[PDB]
Design a protein around this ligand. Structure first.
Ligand SMILES: OC[C@H]1O[C@H](OC[C@H]2O[C@H](O[C@]3(CO)O[C@H](CO)[C@@H](O)[C@@H]3O)[C@H](O)[C@@H](O)[C@@H]2O)[C@H](O)[C@@H](O)[C@H]1O
Ligand SMILES: [Ca+2]
Ligand SMILES: [Ca+2]
Ligand SMILES: [Ca+2]
Ligand SMILES: [Ca+2]
Ligand SMILES: [Ca+2]
Ligand SMILES: [Ca+2]
Ligand SMILES: [Ca+2]
Ligand SMILES: [Ca+2]
Ligand SMILES: [Ca+2]
Ligand SMILES: [Ca+2]
Ligand SMILES: [Ca+2]
Ligand SMILES: [Ca+2]
Ligand SMILES: [Ca+2]
Ligand SMILES: [Ca+2]
Ligand SMILES: [Ca+2]
Ligand SMILES: [Ca+2]
Ligand SMILES: [Ca+2]
Ligand SMILES: [Ca+2]
Ligand SMILES: [Ca+2]
Ligand SMILES: [Ca+2]
Ligand SMILES: [Ca+2]
Ligand SMILES: [Ca+2]
Ligand SMILES: [Ca+2]
Ligand SMILES: [Ca+2]
Ligand SMILES: [Ca+2]
Ligand SMILES: [Ca+2]
Ligand SMILES: [Ca+2]
Ligand SMILES: [Ca+2]
Ligand SMILES: [Ca+2]
Ligand SMILES: [Ca+2]
Ligand SMILES: [Ca+2]
Ligand SMILES: [Ca+2]
Ligand SMILES: [Ca+2]
Ligand SMILES: [Ca+2]
Ligand SMILES: [Ca+2]
Ligand SMILES: [Ca+2]
Ligand SMILES: [Ca+2]
Ligand SMILES: [Ca+2]
Ligand SMILES: [Ca+2]
Ligand SMILES: [Ca+2]
Ligand SMILES: [Ca+2]
Ligand SMILES: [Ca+2]
Ligand SMILES: [Ca+2]
Ligand SMILES: [Ca+2]
Ligand SMILES: [Ca+2]
Ligand SMILES: [Ca+2]
Ligand SMILES: [Ca+2]
Ligand SMILES: [Ca+2]
Length: 669
């Protein structure tokens, strides 16, 4: 019915990075050093005064050592604060039970994971093994069904309690496996680690994975942020319903934002919270990472998270009051570029490849996900109809969508699927449905949708919902001008096609609950890592498990109502996960792209590049860091390795020469 082609090549984007490509093992290694050091005030006021054990006793026998060769500016010096600005708000500290701490890097810094992938933008390959983090090493069995994983040994939580296999086991059994606990991010279901996957404790520093498939090496990426980042089991386990009288909601909410010094494996500990104002973190004296000179990380003593808006983060970063931003909203591009064009500018700004994409996602569950009413059920049936999807995508004037955000070479025609900025992308495999409003109108008439009351809006046939007007709800994230502008643009374009679309605008926390609970017809969403990188959270590319897909999940308790193209996509993704053949993997992503875009698994709105904004006083910021690839730039830049030269340091510490207090107690000690 439609004359499909490939999407047109966008304008050339001059100077992205450039990235200084390195080999995987140039960044870090685990080893003992001859001696260790720390800020002088810790030795004088805490160690010598009895208050803390000497540094060597606090560290693992073999800490994680950052290699000097990979440091952009070399070994650092202690001091200063990194000031972040966020549009989110904390719910509390229970990350593994699905509570947000405010986004914008806070949970990334607090909740460290088994592996780490964000700094891998500097390795020029897509078969890179994730960096060891809380898991120091691992080995595959000969048959590839068993993965023996060795943990960092001798590391402690920020309160001095030992980190070991008990924390790993508690997260796996009582958060992942437990169907009443869902970690933050919408992922981390048991099937995200493979169907029938088991994890068992061997000893205090050894765990063992058992996989149905042979060598599913892709799951090492799933073990990084956000899906395998354990909480302090000694604090959380006594609050869990399996070991107490608490309900699941009581367990989820047992650590509100007012609860101080929540134990972490991260470089800084939350010490202060003021509603709608600020979160202050102070250096963790038990941090288990050091530089090659034996200096215990982080270099920065303090981190701030100013509670504001996402657009204010850009404003503060270019003004110099904020130290970091991911410039990701096109309506802020011109003003940010103008302010950064001044040679006296306090911050540096650098655009990367086109990795920020937006999709229209349709709820594909016709078997009760989100318990829809008669109206909602009739929309699910239209969403599952391929002619309806072809009409919706063909009624979009993608050039006009791009123009509505920003002029210039930023936007690209985006039909959906894998981002054009990543190496697995193939233009020839991308099905583009050009703007054909007349063809879209004929396609809807062919499935029995026609305006029977002269109001310009299409009615269902008399057999469905008494022949009333089709009414579609659109779930939108209220925190971003981009999301809201795209939603408004979509409503106008659908009105021309004859479909009535109603915006349901919600704040982040409520938006995530409505989405993951399946309480939506359609939604507007910025793409997560699987479309920007393929290799990070690959399970999110298709409904490989009952809850791995963003738009097709099963209600509890029920199975998936997969359409044939979705089963073909699930098969491609599972084959990719267990393949170590580069040529086969590239071919599988071409087939994946083709099936996705031909069948309209989602409908692309637009795609463009973002820019990293960092205050100039910071040393060790890697060149060409993208804002979003394997993770957000807050992770990729390795904040625990950043430093400021003594003569350039700001004097912004709110708790200078202080360390975190005890969990559930007072302010910094
Ligand atoms: O956390 C660092 C990040 O914070 C801000 O974005 C947070 C954003 O996260 C969620 O949105 C996405 C995109 O749809 O969903 C995946 C998984 O949760 C995230 O990777 C991705 O951002 C929430 O659904 C949003 O409500 C929430 O605001 C900020 O925009 C980023 O630049 C970066 O600082
Ligand atoms: Ca284009
Ligand atoms: Ca390498
Ligand atoms: Ca090499
Ligand atoms: Ca000192
Ligand atoms: Ca001893
Ligand atoms: Ca080196
Ligand atoms: Ca050096
Ligand atoms: Ca200091
Ligand atoms: Ca400071
Ligand atoms: Ca931020
Ligand atoms: Ca074997
Ligand atoms: Ca040890
Ligand atoms: Ca000990
Ligand atoms: Ca845990
Ligand atoms: Ca679970
Ligand atoms: Ca198990
Ligand atoms: Ca098997
Ligand atoms: Ca313990
Ligand atoms: Ca109980
Ligand atoms: Ca309960
Ligand atoms: Ca409950
Ligand atoms: Ca709950
Ligand atoms: Ca309750
Ligand atoms: Ca709470
Ligand atoms: Ca914690
Ligand atoms: Ca607040
Ligand atoms: Ca207040
Ligand atoms: Ca106030
Ligand atoms: Ca030194
Ligand atoms: Ca505000
Ligand atoms: Ca915008
Ligand atoms: Ca520019
Ligand atoms: Ca994106
Ligand atoms: Ca169909
Ligand atoms: Ca344009
Ligand atoms: Ca233009
Ligand atoms: Ca465009
Ligand atoms: Ca291509
Ligand atoms: Ca009508
Ligand atoms: Ca009709
Ligand atoms: Ca538009
Ligand atoms: Ca199922
Ligand atoms: Ca299947
Ligand atoms: Ca590969
Ligand atoms: Ca510098
Ligand atoms: Ca560099
Ligand atoms: Ca300040
Ligand atoms: Ca407290």
């Amino acid at each position: 019915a439609f004359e499909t082609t490939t999407p047109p090549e966008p304008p050339q984007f001059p100077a992205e990075g450039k990235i200084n490509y390195v080999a995987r093992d140039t960044i870090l290694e685990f080893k003992a050093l001859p001696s260790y050091s720390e800020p002088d005030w810790i030795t004088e006021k805490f160690e010598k005064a009895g208050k803390l054990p000497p540094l060597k006793e606090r560290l693992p026998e073999e800490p994680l050592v950052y290699k000097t060769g990979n440091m952009p500016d070399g070994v650092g010096v202690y001091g200063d604060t990194m000031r972040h600005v966020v549009g989110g708000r904390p719910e509390g500290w229970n990350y593994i039970a699905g509570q947000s701490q405010g986004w914008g890097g806070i949970d990334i810094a607090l909740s460290e994971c088994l592996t780490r992938t964000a700094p891998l933008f500097q390795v020029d390959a897509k078969d890179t093994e994730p960096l060891p983090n809380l898991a120091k090493s691992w080995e595959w069995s000969e048959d590839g069904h068993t993965l023996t994983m060795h943990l960092v040994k001798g590391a402690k939580w920020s309160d001095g309690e030992a980190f070991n296999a008990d924390d790993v086991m508690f997260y796996w059994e009582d958060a992942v496996v437990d169907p009443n606990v869902s970690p933050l991010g919408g992922g981390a279901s048991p099937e995200a680690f493979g169907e029938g996957t088991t994890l068992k404790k061997i000893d205090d520093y050894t765990v063992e994975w058992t996989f149905k498939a042979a060598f599913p090496k892709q799951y090492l990426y799933t073990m990084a942020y956000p899906s395998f980042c354990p909480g302090p089991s000694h604090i959380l386990k006594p609050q869990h319903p399996k070991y107490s009288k608490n309900t699941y909601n009581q367990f989820k909410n047992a650590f509100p934002p007012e609860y101080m010094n929540m134990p972490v494996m991260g470089a800084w500990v939350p010490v202060s919270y003021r509603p709608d104002d600020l979160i202050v973190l102070r250096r963790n004296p038990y941090y288990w990472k050091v530089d090659e000179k034996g200096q215990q990380l982080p270099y920065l003593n303090e981190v701030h998270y100013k509670l504001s808006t996402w657009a204010d983060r850009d404003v503060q970063a270019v003004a110099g009051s904020g130290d970091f931003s991911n410039l990701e909203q096109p309506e802020n591009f011109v003003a940010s570029l103008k302010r950064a064009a001044d040679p006296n500018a306090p911050a540096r700004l650098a655009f990367g490849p086109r990795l920020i994409g937006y999709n229209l996602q349709m709820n594909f569950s016709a078997n009760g996900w989100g318990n829809p009413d008669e109206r909602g059920q009739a929309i699910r049936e239209l969403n599952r109809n391929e002619v309806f999807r072809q009409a919706v995508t063909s009624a979009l004037d993608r050039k006009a969508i791009g123009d509505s955000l920003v002029k210039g070479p930023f936007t690209a025609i985006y039909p959906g699927g894998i981002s054009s900025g990543t190496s697995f992308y193939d233009r020839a495999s991308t099905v583009y449905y050009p703007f054909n409003l007349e063809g879209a109108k004929a396609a809807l008439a062919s499935i029995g949708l026609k305006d029977t009351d002269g109001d310009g809006f299409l009615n269902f046939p008399k057999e469905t919902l008494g022949g009333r007007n089709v009414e579609i709800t659109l779930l939108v994230n209220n925190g971003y001008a981009t999301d809201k502008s795209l939603a408004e643009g979509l409503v106008g374009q659908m009105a021309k096609l004859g479909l009535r679309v109603v915006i349901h605008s919600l704040d982040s926390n409520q938006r995530d609950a409505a989405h993951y609970g399946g309480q939506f017809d359609w939604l507007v969403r910025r793409n997560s890592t699987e479309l920007s990188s393929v290799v990070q959270n690959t399970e999110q590319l298709a409904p490989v498990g009952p809850r791995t897909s963003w738009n097709h999940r099963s209600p509890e308790g029920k199975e998936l109502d997969l359409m044939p193209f979705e089963k073909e996509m699930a098969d491609i993704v599972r084959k990719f996960i267990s393949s170590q053949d580069n040529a086969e993997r590239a071919d599988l992503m071409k087939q994946y792209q083709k099936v996705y875009t031909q069948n309209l698994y989602t409908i692309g709105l637009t795609e463009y590049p973002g820019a990293l904004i960092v205050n100039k006083r910071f040393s060790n910021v890697p060149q060409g860091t993208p804002i979003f690839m394997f993770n957000w730039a807050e992770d990729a830049i390795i904040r625990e390795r950043l430093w400021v030269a003594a003569d350039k340091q700001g004097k912004y510490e709110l708790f200078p020469q202080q360390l975190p207090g005890k969990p559930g107690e007072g302010g910094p000690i």
